[PDB]
Design a protein around this ligand. Structure first.
Ligand SMILES: CC(=O)N[C@H]1[C@H](O[C@H](CO)[C@@H](O)[C@@H](O)COP(=O)(O)O)O[C@H](CO)[C@@H](O)[C@@H]1O
Ligand code: NA
Ligand code: NA
Lengths: 227, 213
């Protein structure tokens, strides 16, 4: 299938630079334009620039003058976006998106394929990996025939953390909550799942926590609560 | 740049309703307008291009109209998977501007939450702090009141809530309320209770445990 695969979330200090990658799969990179679009949660997307990987031609939005560079490596079907002299206000999700190669001066810069986005956070604060604790099922976490269980992902900085269950094989009934900001300046979230209570004891439930800024990958097997 | 203004900023409609969203361009853009739907934690996804052309694989319930400076997106029969934020985007010129979006919230019948409580893990207590989590699952509407009681004393200032986005299939929400105490403060009390008040509940539901059972 046609996809755009982006590099992981990053954290940078103010004044530094970030370089995000975008790998085209299922189509040839040089047959379309590649575009970069950012979005800070709470605002509409903001288009940054385009690149034609075949010709080495680029065009940037005036708001990013002298700060962005779009490059490519056609041998590995990859496009790159480098944003420099980073400011706190550059904290956002950065997407790569495909559009058609336009002849001069035809129109058509709309986006028919997108990467999943890369969160880039600009901060002076220290990076901190999360602690993962079980939300163990007990007699106090049932509703009829349903049992709830989960994982508490506490004290990490910056965002994001991702949580999967059973390496992505368990998705139905999962709620990974939006993070909260604690008074400490660290984030926390929980991921819960509802399952048959008849399933406890035969089924295995493992939460897979990933925090790319601290290179944290934790697997936690969740078992019935110790009394 | 061409400023794109969308209206309304937010709307709430039921499954089966006919919904219209407008987009205004600060100057003429002919028909060089695209529409996208953005679902939570996802990139925007293309619905329409050239003001009225339906992107391949997009459901037939979506349609677009307009030219020049005034454009409309119509959803003929709103479905639960239509919740999200809708953006218009001009591509007549730089900076290929998007609007600020229209948030579409789905209305549905009242659904009472199922309530679950979790004592802190032995592993976390070993580290010096106790997080007690109360889960309100799959309810509608979003308005819910959660009150923490420790040995029947009403708590204030030691909890935080988080609510999910609406579910793409059943349009409900879930919510977590987390009470955080030091291990010393947690060890001073016995009864830990989460009291939930919601429109779908005849009277408040309390989920509680005694520290150690
Ligand atoms: C071969 C090639 O590079 N094609 C690009 C084209 O480039 C032409 C010149 O060949 C011009 O149109 C472009 O150099 C204008 O640049 P700017 O936007 O004023 O900075 O621009 C289109 C888009 O216009 C892109 O789709 C397309 O890949
Ligand atoms: Na430019
Ligand atoms: Na153009």
């Amino acid at each position: 299938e046609v996809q755009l695969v982006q590099s992981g979330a990053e954290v940078k200090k103010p004044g530094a630079s970030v370089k995000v990658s975008c790998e085209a799969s299922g189509y040839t990179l040089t047959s379309y334009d590649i575009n970069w679009v950012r979005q800070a949660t709470g605002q509409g997307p903001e288009w940054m620039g385009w690149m034609n990987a075949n010709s080495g031609n680029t065009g940037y939005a005036q708001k990013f003058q002298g700060r962005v560079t779009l490059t490519g490596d056609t041998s590995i079907s990859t496009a790159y976006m480098e944003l420099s002299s980073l400011r706190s206000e550059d904290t956002a999700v950065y997407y790569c998106a495909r559009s058609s190669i336009l002849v001069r001066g035809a129109l058509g810069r709309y986006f028919d394929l997108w990467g999943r986005g890369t969160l880039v956070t600009v901060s002076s604060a220290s990076t901190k990996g999360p602690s993962v604790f079980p939300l163990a099922p007990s007699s106090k976490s049932t509703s009829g025939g349903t049992a709830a269980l989960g994982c508490l992902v506490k004290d990490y900085f910056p965002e994001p953390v991702t949580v999967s269950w059973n390496s992505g094989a368990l998705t139905s009934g999962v709620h990974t909550f939006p993070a909260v900001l604690q008074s400490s300046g660290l984030y926390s979230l929980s991921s819960v799942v509802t399952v048959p209570s008849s399933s406890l004891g035969t089924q295995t439930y493992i939460c897979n926590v990933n925090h790319k800024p601290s290179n944290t990958k934790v697997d936690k097997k969740v078992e019935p609560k110790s009394c | 740049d061409i400023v794109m203004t969308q209206s309304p900023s937010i709307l709430s409609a039921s499954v089966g309703d006919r919904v219209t969203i407008t987009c205004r361009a600060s100057q003429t853009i002919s028909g060089w307008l695209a529409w996208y739907q953005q679902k939570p934690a996802e990139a925007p996804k293309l619905l329409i291009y050239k003001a009225s052309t339906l992107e391949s694989g997009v459901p037939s319930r979506f349609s677009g109209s307009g030219s020049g400076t005034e454009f409309t997106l119509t959803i003929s029969s709103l479905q639960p998977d239509d919740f999200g934020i809708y953006y218009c985007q001009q591509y007549k010129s730089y900076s290929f501007n998007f609007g600020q979006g229209t948030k579409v919230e789905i209305k549905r019948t009242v659904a009472a939450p199922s309530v679950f409580i979790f004592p802190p893990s032995d592993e976390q207590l070993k580290s010096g702090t106790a997080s007690v989590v109360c889960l309100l699952n799959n309810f509608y509407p979003r308005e819910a009141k959660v009150q923490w009681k420790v040995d029947n004393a009403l708590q204030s200032g030691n909890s935080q809530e988080s609510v999910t986005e609406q579910d793409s299939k059943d349009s409900t929400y879930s919510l977590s309320s987390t009470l955080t105490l030091s291990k010393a403060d947690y060890e001073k009390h016995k009864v830990y209770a989460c009291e939930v008040t919601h429109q779908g509940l005849s009277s408040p539901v309390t989920k509680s445990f005694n520290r150690g059972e």
